[PDB]
Design an enzyme around this catalytic site. Structure first.
Site, PDB file in Angstrom:
ATOM      1  N   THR D  25       0.862  -1.168   0.000  1.00 18.09           N
ATOM      2  CA  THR D  25       0.000   0.000   0.000  1.00 18.09           C
ATOM      3  C   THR D  25       0.902   1.222   0.000  1.00 18.09           C
ATOM      4  OG1 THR D  25      -1.567   1.311   1.311  1.00 18.09           O
ATOM      5  CG2 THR D  25      -0.212  -0.302   2.497  1.00 18.09           C
ATOM      6  N   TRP D 151     -12.159   1.989  -0.798  1.00 19.56           N
ATOM      7  CA  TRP D 151     -10.976   2.701  -0.360  1.00 19.56           C
ATOM      8  C   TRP D 151     -11.182   4.142   0.081  1.00 19.56           C
ATOM      9  CZ3 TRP D 151     -10.940   6.772  -3.446  1.00 19.56           C
ATOM     10  CH2 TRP D 151     -11.339   6.636  -4.784  1.00 19.56           C
ATOM     11  N   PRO D 176     -10.776  -5.486   3.297  1.00 13.16           N
ATOM     12  CA  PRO D 176     -10.617  -4.082   2.906  1.00 13.16           C
ATOM     13  C   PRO D 176     -10.146  -4.022   1.468  1.00 13.16           C
ATOM     14  CG  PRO D 176      -8.683  -4.821   4.114  1.00 13.16           C
ATOM     15  CD  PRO D 176      -9.679  -5.966   4.159  1.00 13.16           C
ATOM     16  N   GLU D 178      -7.720  -3.381  -1.452  1.00 16.17           N
ATOM     17  CA  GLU D 178      -6.272  -3.548  -1.548  1.00 16.17           C
ATOM     18  C   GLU D 178      -5.566  -2.191  -1.533  1.00 16.17           C
ATOM     19  OE1 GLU D 178      -9.036  -4.381  -3.588  1.00 16.17           O
ATOM     20  OE2 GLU D 178      -8.050  -5.602  -5.128  1.00 16.17           O
ATOM     21  N   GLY D 208      -9.596  -8.255  -5.109  1.00 19.43           N
ATOM     22  CA  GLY D 208     -10.970  -8.604  -5.388  1.00 19.43           C
ATOM     23  C   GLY D 208     -11.066  -9.824  -6.281  1.00 19.43           C
ATOM     24  N   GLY D 229     -17.750   0.250  -6.739  1.00 16.90           N
ATOM     25  CA  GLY D 229     -18.284   0.609  -8.044  1.00 16.90           C
ATOM     26  C   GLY D 229     -19.436  -0.266  -8.515  1.00 16.90           C
ATOM     27  N   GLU D 251     -23.797  -1.150  -1.777  1.00 19.46           N
ATOM     28  CA  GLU D 251     -23.754   0.304  -1.752  1.00 19.46           C
ATOM     29  C   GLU D 251     -22.842   0.726  -2.903  1.00 19.46           C
ATOM     30  OE1 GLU D 251     -25.421   2.308   0.278  1.00 19.46           O
ATOM     31  OE2 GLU D 251     -26.113   0.998   1.905  1.00 19.46           O
ATOM     32  N   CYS D 285     -19.324   8.895  -2.532  1.00 21.75           N
ATOM     33  CA  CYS D 285     -20.289   8.294  -3.456  1.00 21.75           C
ATOM     34  C   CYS D 285     -21.557   9.092  -3.661  1.00 21.75           C
ATOM     35  CB  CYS D 285     -20.662   6.908  -2.983  1.00 21.75           C
ATOM     36  SG  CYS D 285     -19.304   5.759  -3.197  1.00 21.75           S
ATOM     37  N   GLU D 386     -19.968   8.403 -13.593  1.00 18.93           N
ATOM     38  CA  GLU D 386     -19.361   8.696 -12.303  1.00 18.93           C
ATOM     39  C   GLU D 386     -17.870   8.882 -12.478  1.00 18.93           C
ATOM     40  OE1 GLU D 386     -19.245   5.720  -9.114  1.00 18.93           O
ATOM     41  OE2 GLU D 386     -20.026   7.312  -7.781  1.00 18.93           O
TER      42      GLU D 386
END
Ligand SMILES: NC(=O)[C@@H]1CC=CN([C@@H]2O[C@H](COP(=O)(O)OP(=O)(O)OC[C@H]3O[C@@H](n4cnc5c(N)ncnc54)[C@H](O)[C@@H]3O)[C@@H](O)[C@H]2O)C1
Ligand SMILES: NC(=O)[C@@H]1CC=CN([C@@H]2O[C@H](COP(=O)(O)OP(=O)(O)OC[C@H]3O[C@@H](n4cnc5c(N)ncnc54)[C@H](O)[C@@H]3O)[C@@H](O)[C@H]2O)C1
Ligand SMILES: [K+]
Ligand SMILES: [K+]
Ligand SMILES: [K+]
Ligand SMILES: [K+]
Lengths: 489, 489, 489, 489
Positions: D25, D151, D176, D178, D208, D229, D251, D285, D386
């Site tokens: 990360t 994220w 969580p 990545e 994912g 997304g 969501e 979002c 978006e």
């Protein structure tokens, strides 16, 4: 004289009372005696209680959907007999046929229709405590309950009381007002004809100081639902409590404030003000009898009210074109005029009306003119006390918060309303107004879904809405122990 | 003499009363005077009401989660001070330390902890009527409410009353029993120390016929929550209604039936029977004081009860090994013995006890022996009337339905319970038993989640559970009109 | 064909499909073609959606009570046409007229009747945040939804899906199983006849691979409610998901356990087991096809099962004396015979049946005899897999925890049931069983008030009960800011 | 690396992954490696599920109040560690310390605090059918659930998912993003430290395509809650569906409209628009990225937006004076720059920004300037898609119905908002907007009590509020037959 002598209704039929006494009901539009009406004796009350105790067992033993179907049939009969009942209600109350045939029975049946649909929805709770114990609640009928009616909306009140009572599986003994006992008896017939078991809806006619009192004191009656004056309300509630600790619903009087904010459309405000004061000749409990107007709007508002009052069609209630009839009774008229006189005596500015209408024919009824007082003060009698007649008090304010504080400054708390186009004013004001029934930019609409009732001395409990159905049941908590029980001994 | 003179608690501190009078509270284990306690005057009531009106505004203005956090802090303090409070409660009530330190404060704080968590969950409804109108309800605080306590579980009662009241955003003025005023004052300190605003929880000490009466009559107090005898209950409720039409909760007495079915495990039945009669020396309102036993099981059941009564450790309540203390007061002892005498006089079979325990030291307290009568009849005074002391009445039946009918045959309706291993018996019986609190194969457990209260003359309203929180609010209906308003005038 | 060619129902009337393709439905009792049925094209699906979008706007624009009255009218029509509908359903499914006349339409209409009454009860929440902000929620219609039916209870399933859908203000496009398309078209006529606006209930006929797929893929459909096999369920739910993120309801298959405890009435147990396996010739999803018997009860219970199976009246489903018809189709029959064969091969003990019935008229139908296998093992194919035919597997157990773990040892979780007279065992067992639908001392009853659906791979979501009505709306939170807005920028 | 290698959290402690693979990360402010992070293997997922199944049994076996107390302790720890956590989150996401210190942990903990209080309020229903049968429901835990995080609000999202999951008695395995794995591992330590049993909250790190996929496919996981997304959402929901028929919460993203009506305060409108676009550098979002302004207000509103954008303090997120940090990663930045480029190409009018910020230290980070485009058209890529970056699109409209239809003209439906002072317009507009989260005269506030989630392709299910707690249980209906069972056979 116009009608046959009216008897008691017990066990799905008419029965002779055992008091030897009667009273008379008068058409207030012309003084004609409508009917001799029997007075229930103390022993008649006992008979009706025993009938109710038995009927309730049959009714509660039917399935939810069975009660639902029967109450729907009653709704259907009410719909078809809407005009006959309205005509009867107009004779007994003096209210215009224009109102009784579009409001009284219509909104009465609406509530019955609502509750009929809700019978299968009555549910208890389930609560797990641990692997070896859980709780479930049951909502059980109260059993025998009694409704006591007022005279301003006789059949509507009977319906709004009996509907949730019957839907929750109770029996109700109903005592209509002495002034207006006629439609209640018709309702009893209709229930029976819809399939409601004998004894589930019984009607006792007579006076409150006797029959009403006896219902309130009876040890086998579980709950009293009352609608009437605050003073009477307190006595009924006390007698209900001291006798056998009954449950109570109290729908009482008010001195409801209507606050016109300075941004308000005065046409709408005026329409609202006049509707909130002169519908049913000012005999609605939720009436907005204290109208607050900001000083910047007073003159124009008074004019707009005046233009509307002047076109009010006072007349024979049996004429479809009438929209303002006489009051319910000559004695009540005398009381309203008494209040009107005090307003004059106390130097409030009479804007219009203020007198009895005695001109040809109108002298035969109890007609008071739509009366408007302005420049009123918070210490005036017309401002402090419930009049229950067509008397609007217009009061001036300069600070919006002052208006609210003054609106709240009373032992009443039935209804309240605001007129404004401003989002923040509407909701913030309504939140601070101490009342159970609150209108924004409208007045008087009381949907079946909406629970209604007073804050403070205007009431205890509610009518209509989900909550009211629940309060015609009592909660039983059942704890099931599935494991071991430990004794300290 | 043991303690400093006790003062009133108003506005987050102790204040001097203005009556000039005091009373004394006595330890019933030894006759020692615990403390002089001040009597509130009519003007002290006024002071506490004004304090409460102001505190409630501060409290209600905090967010839900803010109230939640504060009430949790109080819970925490109650947990840490559990033993000090129990010791105090044992001194004041005579109840064994074994009970007060594991039940009284524990279950009192449980309910407070429960309600603390629920504050953000209080919600109104939303109801669309049509594109241009909708309704929302608000659940608003009542404002100032008053709790009146009994003497059997002083602090527990204060907690069960104040918790939902405060959680719903109200202020409560609490009047503990004259017999047991000590722990209530401690609770007031703890609230203040947790962050509860001044005036939100005030305590007035004094007598019911005065202070209690004055709270009940006050026009600014919105609701009375009462716990005590049915007779007192009716007077309190009536005075509450007639004065200003207050809301009421009534937790009253009972003569609760316990039905042992013929398939029951008699060991479990006996443990239940003895727990349901002799816990807190028989001074629990939900006590199962009428025990139904089927004729086939009577002899063995009586023996099993007897074996358990004989091992009851009556003694000094301050001794941890005591599990049965004296009664709360010498006068109450005299009343219990009075009832015991009537049982003898009416030819009920005395199985055990029946006398005052006067032996060395015990003569200094108000100790009645655990008493069991059998072969009792439904017309006996010990069977019909609430004794509120360690007196079990065993009654014999032959038909299970007869047992139920007799169980129901009373003006009381607080609790009921059945002992059986049979699925159908358990649920069918419990459904027909007319009581608000129903136990299957257990007794006396009253979880925070479980709403509790009486049917008939045992009560009005409930305590604990979701429903109780809701009833410390009042419903306001708000109708928003977004379209046009139509006037008939 | 017995009947004329069946067309699509779109916009309040029948219309021609645009596929130029048909299929046929066959009476499984005799092999006769009942009807040609048109296959919907993609364009037809598109037409049905457009029609639905427009219908839904009209329907949603009416008031709650208007919708309520219209659905009630539909109920009345279904009550009147119960026998015609039953007879048609018997032709299409092969189920006995004795079942269809008393179960399918009756319980379908029951659910519609329940929801019709609930329309005015659909409510949002209102949450106060602070004096200058509050939240209210709305429960808004989803819009256009699709229901995909199964062949075992065609009209009932159409009713249980469409009732809450329509009650909540949605339009539904329904696709019946290609095996049983007939009654769904009748329901559409009935809705229209009752006053349901054109487009609100449309029916498309065709296959799952085409029409059903196209419905799950359509971007304007908000929700799919599906009843059928688990394998197909997964495909349907994945297509609904990945296409446009639709909400879903899945009522899938099961291998539901029935546990008979050693204290059971074995006559009730055998009645329960037989009803749980052989009603609708074993084509019920909640069937208790894994029957657990304690070792001590094995012989006796098998004999009691055998007595009941021997008196089953297998026959012509149109004969009112028949209580066991053929299976729904020849390929389904073959699948069931394969499973039966598998049972023999894996050395289960055949207690009865095990064969196709071919004598006389029966050979023209799809008749499988009521089959019972015993001495089964958990690893047997007939024990692990849903057969969906009249095949009971009896499994012996020695202790109660073993039975429960074995009951739970499956990917399914639709229903479960226990038979016992013991209070504690009934509830404790039921709480440990991993199934959404649990019966104690009964089986198969599915009241409108009771939410039904599967745990694990047997389901997602529920049907019936209050909850299902809520899940046909979507929640919109509305936050009203009445005060200042603070930006960080 | 700034920190040591991050390991999996399974069973109340860190453990070694068995993949032999890692990823890293990176701090998006400077490009530094914060940490190596282990990738979970399939075996590790299997381990995490086993651990979860065992933890859940322990957790579920505790009482409601025990769970409640433990979650409250977690809240306390989060309150204490707020600043440490904020600082870590700022490192991982690049969001300004001023946001992370006051929003992320505060509102995450707020939700946990809310649900902790609600645990004892989770209740089933009880429904009486007839005297010999009733139903009760149980709300049982789902069992093991998985949460997959995004994220932009890593720890908050972990808290909003795990809070109701754990409150309802489930165990959750959380993965969580990545991009931001750091704080989720901290939360796991905190839960354990608070007394949450081992296995109840496990954290798996990885991608994912691998770990996330494996979680959605696992047959023992009952529910997936996903935030991210829309495209990924569809894939996740389809894999959860088709694998084992899991319940899902999604969501997803949005293109939420903000409608500024001609009667709006334009200073509030500009504050709202800027907050709705530039908070967390536009990586929220629910951002109102389509801003509708009336033609008469265009010039004036653009100027007011420009004044606010010009004073945005873009800078080092660790500087407390910064209120606009870089984006979360370099590839996300590039995607945003591409969209910005698309906007220029399609002839939108650039009002400000439109470029990467590269001066000095900024070039080492992923900084995109706050960008505003105006004179946009509905067919522009920047208006349809978006962007998830700080890019506001201003769209001019002429009448109000046009604005609403245009607001609704999208596949998305996450949030919507209106700015107006008019009472009727506020509610009427909001009722027509097709979004799950609606704000009037504000934006972005998301109280724990308020259910939030998307309409259409923006979501399935809800987070926060009472409803979400219910959707972390499954309903089991239990029918108790107390009378006879009738078989047809
Ligand atoms: N909330 C609302 O909307 C309301 C809508 C209706 C009008 N509303 C109220 O109704 C009043 C009119 O009634 P009133 O001229 O004052 O007679 P009474 O209030 O006494 O008459 C009411 C009934 O009480 C029975 N009764 C009388 N004395 C009794 C006694 N001692 N024990 C037991 N019962 C007794 C009596 O027989 C009659 O049937 C108005 O003041 C309104 O406030 C508001
Ligand atoms: N439901 C349950 O569980 C319950 C649990 C507790 C015991 N339960 C009941 O408590 C009773 C014991 O109390 P008691 O020896 O009869 O005195 P009183 O019942 O009068 O004392 C109660 C309180 O009332 C105040 N008071 C007195 N007179 C008043 C007046 N006129 N106006 C206003 N207030 C008045 C008084 O100051 C005291 O604080 C038992 O009979 C149980 O039934 C059942
Ligand atoms: K009141
Ligand atoms: K009562
Ligand atoms: K599932
Ligand atoms: K969706």
């Amino acid at each position: 004289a116009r009608f046959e002598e009216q008897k008691l209704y017990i066990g799905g039929r008419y029965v002779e009372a055992s008091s030897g006494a009667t009273f008379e009901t008068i058409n207030p539009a012309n003084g004609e005696v409508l009917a001799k009406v029997q007075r229930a004796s103390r022993e008649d009350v006992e008979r009706a209680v025993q009938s109710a105790v038995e009927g309730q067992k049959v009714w509660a033993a039917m399935t939810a959907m069975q009660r639902s179907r029967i109450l729907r049939r009653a709704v259907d009969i009410l719909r078809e007999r809407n005009d006959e009942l309205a005509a009867l209600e107009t004779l007994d109350t003096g209210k215009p046929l224009a109102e009784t045939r579009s409001v009284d029975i219509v909104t009465g049946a609406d509530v019955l229709e609502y509750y009929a649909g809700l019978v299968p929805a009555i549910e208890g709770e389930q609560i797990p405590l641990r692997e070896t114990s859980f709780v479930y609640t049951r909502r059980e009928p109260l059993g025998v309950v009694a409704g006591i009616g007022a005279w301003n909306y006789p059949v509507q009140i009977a319906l709004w009381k009996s509907a949730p009572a019957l839907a929750a599986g109770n029996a109700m003994i109903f005592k209509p007002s002495e002034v207006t006992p006629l439609t209640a008896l018709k309702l009893a017939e209709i229930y029976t004809e819809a399939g409601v078991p004998d004894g589930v809806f019984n009607v006792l006619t007579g006076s409150g100081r006797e029959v009403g009192q006896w219902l309130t004191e009876h040890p086998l009656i579980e709950k009293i639902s009352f609608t009437g004056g605050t003073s009477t309300g307190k006595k009924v509630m006390a007698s209900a409590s001291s006798s056998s600790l009954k449950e109570v619903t109290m729908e009482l009087g008010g001195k409801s404030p209507l606050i016109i904010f300075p941004d308000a459309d005065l046409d709408r405000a005026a329409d609202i003000a006049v509707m909130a004061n002169f519908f049913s000749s000012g005999q609605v409990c939720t009436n907005g009898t204290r109208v607050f107007i900001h000083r910047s709007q007073q003159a124009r508002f008074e004019a707009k009210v005046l233009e509307r009052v002047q076109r009010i069609r006072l007349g024979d209630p049996q004429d479809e074109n009438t929209n303002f009839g006489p009051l319910v009774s000559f004695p009540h008229m005398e009381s309203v005029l008494g209040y009107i006189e005090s307003g004059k005596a106390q130097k409030a500015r009479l804007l219009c009306g203020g007198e009895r209408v005695t001109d040809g024919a109108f002298g035969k009824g109890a007609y008071v003119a739509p009366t408007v007082f302005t420049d009123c003060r918070d210490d005036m009698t017309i401002v402090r006390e419930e009049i229950f007649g067509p008397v609007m008090s217009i009061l001036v304010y300069d600070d919006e918060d002052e208006a609210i504080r003054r609106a709240n400054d009373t032992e009443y708390g039935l209804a309240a309303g605001v007129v404004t186009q401003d989002l923040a004013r509407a909701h913030r004001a309504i939140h601070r107004l101490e009342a159970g029934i609150c209108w924004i930019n409208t007045w008087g609409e009381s949907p079946a879904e909406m629970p209604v009732g007073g804050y403070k001395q205007s009431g205890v409990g509610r009518e209509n809405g989900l909550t009211t159905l629940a309060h015609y049941t009592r909660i039983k908590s059942v704890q099931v122990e599935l494991g071991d029980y430990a004794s300290v001994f």
